[PDB]
Amino acid sequence: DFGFINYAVLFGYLAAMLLVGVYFSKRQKTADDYFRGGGRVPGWAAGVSVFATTLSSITFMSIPAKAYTSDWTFIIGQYLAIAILPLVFYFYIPFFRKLKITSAYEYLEARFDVRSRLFASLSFMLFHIGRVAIITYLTVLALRPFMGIDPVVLIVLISLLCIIYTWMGGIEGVIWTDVIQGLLLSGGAVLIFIMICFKVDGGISEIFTTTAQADKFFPTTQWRWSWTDSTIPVLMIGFLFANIQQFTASQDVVQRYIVTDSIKETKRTLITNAKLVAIIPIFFFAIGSALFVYYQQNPSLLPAGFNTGGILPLFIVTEMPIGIAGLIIAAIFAAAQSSISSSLNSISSCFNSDIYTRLSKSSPSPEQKMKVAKLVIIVAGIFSSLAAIWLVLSSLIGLMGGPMTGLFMLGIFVKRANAGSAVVGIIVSIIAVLAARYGSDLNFFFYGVIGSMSVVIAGTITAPLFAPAKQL
Numbered sequence: 165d166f167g168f169i170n171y172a173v174l175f176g177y178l179a180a181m182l183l184v185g186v187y188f189s190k191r192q193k194t195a196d197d198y199f200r201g202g203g204r205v206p207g208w209a210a211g212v213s214v215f216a217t218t219l220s221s222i223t224f225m226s227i228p229a230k231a232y233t234s235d236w237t238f239i240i241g242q243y244l245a246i247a248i249l250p251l252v253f254y255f256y257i258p259f260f261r262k263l264k265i266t267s268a269y270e271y272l273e274a275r276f277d278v279r280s281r282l283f284a285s286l287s288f289m290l291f292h293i294g295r296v297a298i299i300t301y302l303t304v305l306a307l308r309p310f311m312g313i314d315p316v317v318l319i320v321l322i323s324l325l326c327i328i329y330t331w332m333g334g335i336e337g338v339i340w341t342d343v344i345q346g347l348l349l350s351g352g353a354v355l356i357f358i359m360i361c362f363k364v365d366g367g368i369s370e371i372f373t374t375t376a377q378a379d380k381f382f383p384t385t386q387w388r389w390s391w392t393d394s395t396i397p398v399l400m401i402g403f404l405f406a407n408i409q410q411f412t413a414s415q416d417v418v419q420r421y422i423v424t425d426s427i428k429e430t431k432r433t434l435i436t437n438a439k440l441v442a443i444i445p446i447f448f449f450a451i452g453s454a455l456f457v458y459y460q461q462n463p464s465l466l467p468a469g470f471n472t473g474g475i476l477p478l479f480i481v482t483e484m485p486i487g488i489a490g491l492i493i494a495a496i497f498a499a500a501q502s503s504i505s506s507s508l509n510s511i512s513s514c515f516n517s518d519i520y521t522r523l524s525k526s527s528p529s530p531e532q533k534m535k536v537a538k539l540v541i542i543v544a545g546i547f548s549s550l551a552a553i554w555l556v557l558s559s560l561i562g563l564m565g566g567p568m569t570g571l572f573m574l575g576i577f578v579k580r581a582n583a584g585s586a587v588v589g590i591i592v593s594i595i596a597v598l599a600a601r602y603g604s605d606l607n608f609f610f611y612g613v614i615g616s617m618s619v620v621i622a623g624t625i626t627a628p629l630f631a632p633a634k635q636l
């Protein structure tokens with residue numbers, strides 16, 4: 165059904181990822197190797213790794229589906245992510261590097277106290293358990309109708325093999341597989357779009373024309389304020405705070421800021437990522453618009469009532485030659501596994517620093533830290549894999565991202581804020597996002613904005629009620 169040459173390409177890719185993992189296992193001697201990489205990561209490799217970490221099977225599948233069913237207005241969030249990178253570099257990254265963090269949330273205790281650090285660390289770890297499971301399950305849903313294998317078998321290939329080379333290679337193995345996987349998914353995106361242009365009569369010219377005449381690029385009717393609809397202004401506010409969370413308060417990205425040996429190489433990490441974000445996501449939106457025009461020209465090739473979420477997988481397996489199809493399936497695996505490996509290692513770095521090291525009376529030996537470092541990757545991987553099986557054979561935590569982001573903004577920008585007012589901001593923001601999510605029809609893009617700003621506002625107002633702020 166799927167073919168032998170297609171599987172041979174896919175398992176050639178899977179073998180390469182395992183090989184990179186074994187290679188970098190040789191230098192895994194301390195937790196500083198496993199989590200910080202010994203400063204041996206060049207900036208450009210960390211930058212590709214940031215890009216591959218954030219871009220999962222979520223973007224690979226649902227962005228073309230989004231452009232297919234609607235328009236391109238969500239691409240604004242891509243360039244808002246680039247727009248905030250100078251602010252990240254000048255205000256946040258100096259603290260992460262000078263504190264020589266393993267976990268980004270060590271900043272929160274240095275600025276406030278262990279309460280804010282534990283809140284953000286537990287929220288991150290719990291959220292990214294789900295992110296791994298959701299990434300695995302989305303890849304299964306997209307590939308199961310076309311690979312002809314049991315869904316648990318697919319979960320083993322996607323998740324378990326990724327756990328193995330992640331546990332094997334440390335952050336360096338994670339980063340260098342991310343480099344390979346980031347180039348692969350990017351090349352896959354360009355290749356997919358090119359081959360749709362050949363199969364559409366009129367080529368890219370007809371795709372652009374048909375999409376524009378259907379008003380499926382940037383409909384001016386979406387330039388309007390709304391409290392319920394994902395209009396252009398709403399998604400701009402939502403993606404702004406979703407990107408600030410991703411690049412200032414999220415360990416899987418912040419950890420990349422400290423694997424480089426210098427500030428100059430860190431700046432190049434952001435530049436490398438910005439170049440990929442400016443170019444590669446365009447192709448995923450273009451793939452969606454191209455698939456729209458294609459199945460408007462060939463409506464018989466579309467099953468009646470077909471779920472649009474799998475319109476890109478449907479095209480890939482039916483309209484692309486031998487070997488190329490498996491290369492594209494490898495790029496899909498690459499998009500999923502580059503995000504899973506980063507989440508697992510980052511969950512382990514947070515547990516190692518914020519939980520294991522911080523909450524133990526005696527100081528764990530370097531031997532003990534390494535054991536827990538490798539252990540948590542297996543445990544976090546097992547539970548998120550079982551959750552993925554649960555999702556196939558048959559939100560609340562996500563609302564904490566706002567408060568996590570507000571804590572960092574409060575500490576970095578509000579000097580009067582202290583440990584007590586930060587905790588007040590946490591509690592107030594949790595009430596605010598739960599009220600907005602469950603007691604209103606507010607658009608989901610407002611959740612992160614309400615969580616972040618409630619910590620900033622309440623953490624600033626109630627600051628006099630508590631002892632002085634630590635200077636840091």
Ligand SMILES: CC(=O)N[C@H]1[C@H]([C@H](O)[C@H](O)CO)O[C@](O)(C(=O)O)C[C@@H]1O
Pocket residue numbers: 215218219220221222223224238240241242245403441445503
């Ligand atoms: C603005 C935006 O769309 N952000 C999305 C990013 C970017 O698409 C990717 O980082 C390329 O910049 O990918 C995700 O993290 C993902 O696929 O898991 C989801 C997230 O919603």
Ligand code: NA
Pocket residue numbers: 216217218219220221498499500501502503504
């Ligand atoms: Na990825």
Ligand code: NA
Pocket residue numbers: 216217338339342501502503504505506507
């Ligand atoms: Na990764």
